[PDB]
Amino acid sequence: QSMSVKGRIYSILKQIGSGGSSKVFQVLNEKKQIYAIKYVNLEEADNQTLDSYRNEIAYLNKLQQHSDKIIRLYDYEITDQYIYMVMECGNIDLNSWLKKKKSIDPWERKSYWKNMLEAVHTIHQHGIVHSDLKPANFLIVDGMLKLIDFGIANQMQPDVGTVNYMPPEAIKDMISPKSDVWSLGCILYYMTYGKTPFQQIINQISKLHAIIDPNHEIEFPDIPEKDLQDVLKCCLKRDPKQRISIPELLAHPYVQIQ
Numbered sequence: 001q002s003m004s005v006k007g008r009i010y011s012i013l014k015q016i017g018s019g020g021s022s023k024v025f026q027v028l029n030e031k032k033q034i035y036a037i038k039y040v041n042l043e044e045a046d047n048q049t050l051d052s053y054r055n056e057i058a059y060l061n062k063l064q065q066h067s068d069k070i071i072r073l074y075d076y077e078i079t080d081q082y083i084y085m086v087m088e089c090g091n092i093d094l095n096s097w098l099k100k101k102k103s104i105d106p107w108e109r110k111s112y113w114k115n116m117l118e119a120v121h122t123i124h125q126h127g128i129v130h131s132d133l134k135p136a137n138f139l140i141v142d143g144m145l146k147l148i149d150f151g152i153a154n155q156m157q158p159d160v161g162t163v164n165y166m167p168p169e170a171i172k173d174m175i176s177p178k179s180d181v182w183s184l185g186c187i188l189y190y191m192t193y194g195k196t197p198f199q200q201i202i203n204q205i206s207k208l209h210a211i212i213d214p215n216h217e218i219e220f221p222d223i224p225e226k227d228l229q230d231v232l233k234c235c236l237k238r239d240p241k242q243r244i245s246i247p248e249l250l251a252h253p254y255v256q257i258q
C-alpha cells in the first residue's frame with residue numbers, strides 16, 4: 001500500500017496509531033526518508049470537528065517557525081473526503097516510552113521537562129491552551145521531546161482516555177495557561193515518582209473529588225533533587241493564581257542550574 005500527498009508518493013511501512021477517523025502511518029518517500037503521515041477520513045465529519053482539524057492544521061503550520069519543540073509539518077493535502085499531513089516521524093510517544101521505562105535518568109527527565117516547557121510556552125504565546133496535556137501529546141524525536149498536537153483535533157492511541165492530568169479549575173467550572181502547567185506538573189510527577197498524583201484513586205468520582213479537595217494533600221516524597229520537588233509542589237497548587245507560570249518555570253533552578 002502507498003499514498004500520494006501533493007504529487008509525492010509515500011509507501012506505508014506500518015500504522016503507528018488510529019484515533020477516531022484518523023490514522024497515523026510510518027512511511028517512506030521515494031528517497032527512502034522516513035515520515036509519519038496522519039490520515040483523516042472526513043466522510044462522517046461534522047462542521048464543528050471538521051473546523052477543529054482546519055484550526056489544528058493552521059496553528060501547526062503557523063507555529064513551525066516559532067519552535068523546534070513542535071513537530072515538523074512538511075506538507076498536507078485537504079479535500080472534502082480526507083486530510084493528509086506529512087510530518088516528521090518520531091521514535092515513540094512519551095506515554096509508551098514511560099509505560100516501558102523501568103527507571104528514568106535525571107538528566108533525561110530535566111531535558112524532557114525543558115522541551116515540554118518550551119513547546120507549551122510557544123502555544124501559549126499565540127493564545128492557545130492545550131487543556132488536554134498528557135504524555136501521549138509528546139513525541140520523542142532525536143532524543144528530544146516535541147509537542148504533537150494543540151488539543152483542538154481528536155487524540156490518537158497506538159496500535160481509552162484518562163482524567164489523571166485534569167486541573168481542579170476545569171472540574172470546578174461545572175481554563176487559562178495555568179491549566180497546562182497543572183498537566184505538565186502531573187507528567188513531571190509521573191516521570192519522578194513513577195505515578196500520577198491521583199492514580200491510586202480507582203473510583204473516578206472520588207478521584208475528581210481528590211483533585212479539587214484542598215484538604216487532600218498530594219504526597220511529595222523527599223528526593224535528592226530538591227529543585228525538582230519544588231517544581232512539582234509549584235505546578236500542583238490547586239489555586240491557578242498561586243500555581244507557577246511557564247515563564248517562572250523557565251527561570252527555575254531546576255531548569256537553569258546543572
Ligand SMILES: COc1cc(-c2cnn(C)c2)ccc1Nc1ncc2ccnc(NC3CCCCC3)c2n1
Nearest residue numbers: 016017024036088089090091092093096156157158
Ligand atoms: C516509530 O513511530 C512511532 C511509534 C510509536 C509507538 C511505539 N510503541 N508504541 C506503543 C507506540 C509512537 C509514535 C511514533 N512516531 C510518530 N511520529 C510522528 C507522529 C505524528 C503524529 N502522531 C503520531 N502518533 C500518534 C499515535 C501514536 C501515539 C502518539 C500520537 C506520531 N507518531
